[PDB]
Design a protein around this ligand. Structure first.
Ligand code: HEM
Ligand SMILES: CC(C)C[C@@H]1NC(=O)[C@H](CC(C)C)NC1=O
Length: 393
């Protein structure tokens, strides 16, 4: 019999003691309520994600396609996945990136300008959630006139993708959000293909595979994939970043005096408070980790936050330290963007965007002081603070 469950109320309040227990005592941990095994150690998570043929992404057909309306990038393999991944990357690199970043600076400063006279701002609810959705629409090429509705519908499909055992009414609402996004974006996709622009939607329409153009619902699904993937982690990471810096004033000062450290601080925040906590895969054939036997068709769920705090991978893993280095002590590449075939295509863009935002907040909000002295965190699949208020001059 087992008594420590991922679904204990205590886990969502504070999962760190669970991480420590599971890595030591139950590294491949079965949860009967969802018929899945949770994998907590860095070595095992990395092995699973590096081995796309043994641990495939068929789980996503279930957790995602109902709201994405067609296949997502992570469900693809082979030359199709490689090529469409490259097509998505094009939209956040090269000239597309050079054009997008001044726009994201504008989004950042407009939000700051709304709150600068108030002398406080909620990094979660005033800045992060607004900026995150606007940035994703700017990347895709969706004009912001309806961004508030977009955010509402996004939250509904994200809830579907990040939840376990939702009830029938919650499912209904998430599917209605999906339908509304489809009803809004399909007319825009049609207009885009008869008048191409310089945005990701246009790239996807211009995509050609053996002289074949993919269906408009396939475009919609990759567009929803980008909207969800780019929006959800951003408010969480921005909030955790300023919280951890304000909780470690010495490191916050080092960052002020040396802005080159902001990139390392973002990476450490992603390791320490991983905003995407879980990555599921399906087992393709009998397999064993430690002495836990897995069968073809079983589901394994990689615990990214647990892996990123594995003492086998990091010295003093449960301390926030922006000065960690492989040149120093033990240090590894964190798994916050995944690894292997499906490594986040937006990882580099994310680091550039978050550094821009953090620079502008530090430049314009003078003498930042923490007001939310103790965060409350929510979510076990994606995870972040409910609120993270700072004050400034
Ligand atoms: C801090 C920000 C972000 C984090 C922490 C994050 C996290 C992740 C993780 C953990 C995965 C792996 C999922 C898996 O293996 O099943 C992933 C994949 C992906 N992410 Fe991100 N993500 C971020 C931002 C973005 C952005 C800005 C985009 C913009 C398009 C994006 C698009 C994608 C896509 C398309 C995939 C699927 C990649 C593939 O299948 O090859 N993500 N992300
Ligand atoms: C969105 C998923 C259907 C596929 C894949 N999964 C991920 O974990 C990331 C982040 C989201 C969980 C926000 N994005 C991805 O594309």
């Amino acid at each position: 019999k087992v008594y420590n469950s991922i679904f204990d109320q205590a886990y969502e309040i504070d999962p760190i003691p669970y991480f420590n227990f599971l890595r030591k005592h139950d590294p491949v941990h079965y949860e009967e309520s969802i018929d899945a095994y949770f994998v907590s150690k860095y070595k095992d998570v990395k092995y699973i994600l590096k081995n796309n043929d043994i641990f495939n992404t068929k789980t996503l057909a279930k957790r995602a396609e109902p709201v994405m309306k067609d296949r997502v990038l992570a469900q693809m393999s082979g030359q199709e996945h490689k090529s469409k991944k490259k097509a998505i990357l094009k939209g956040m690199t090269g000239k597309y990136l050079e054009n997008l970043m001044p726009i994201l600076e504008k989004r950042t400063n407009d939000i700051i300008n709304k709150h600068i006279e108030k002398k406080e701002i909620d990094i979660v609810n005033d800045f992060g959630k607004v900026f995150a959705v606007q940035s994703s629409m700017d990347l895709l090429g969706i004009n912001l006139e309806n961004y508030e509705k977009i955010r509402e519908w996004h939250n509904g499909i994200a809830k579907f993708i990040t939840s376990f055992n939702l009830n029938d009414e919650e499912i209904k609402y998430s599917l209605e959000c999906s339908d509304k996004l489809e009803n809004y974006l399909m007319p825009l996709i049609k207009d885009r293909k008869k008048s191409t622009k310089d945005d990701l939607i246009s790239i996807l329409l211009e995509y050609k595979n053996d002289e074949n153009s993919i269906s408009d619902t396939e475009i919609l699904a990759l567009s929803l994939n980008v909207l969800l993937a780019a929006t959800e982690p951003v408010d969480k990471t921005l909030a955790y970043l300023f919280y951890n810096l304000l909780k470690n004033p010495e490191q916050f000062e080092s960052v002020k005096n040396n802005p080159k450290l902001i990139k390392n601080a973002i990476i450490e925040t992603l390791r320490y408070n991983s905003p995407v906590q879980l990555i599921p895969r399906q087992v393709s054939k009998p397999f064993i980790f430690n002495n836990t036997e897995l069968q073809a068709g079983d589901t394994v769920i990689c615990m990214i936050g647990s892996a990123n705090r594995d003492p086998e991978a990091y010295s003093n893993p449960d301390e926030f330290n922006i000065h960690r280095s492989s040149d120093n002590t033990s240090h590894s590449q964190n798994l916050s963007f995944g690894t292997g075939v499906h490594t986040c295509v937006g990882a580099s863009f994310s680091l550039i965007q978050l550094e821009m935002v953090a620079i502008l907040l530090l430049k314009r909000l003078k003498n930042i002081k923490l007001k939310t002295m103790e965060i409350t965190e929510h979510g076990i699949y994606t995870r972040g603070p409910k609120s993270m208020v700072i004050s400034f001059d």
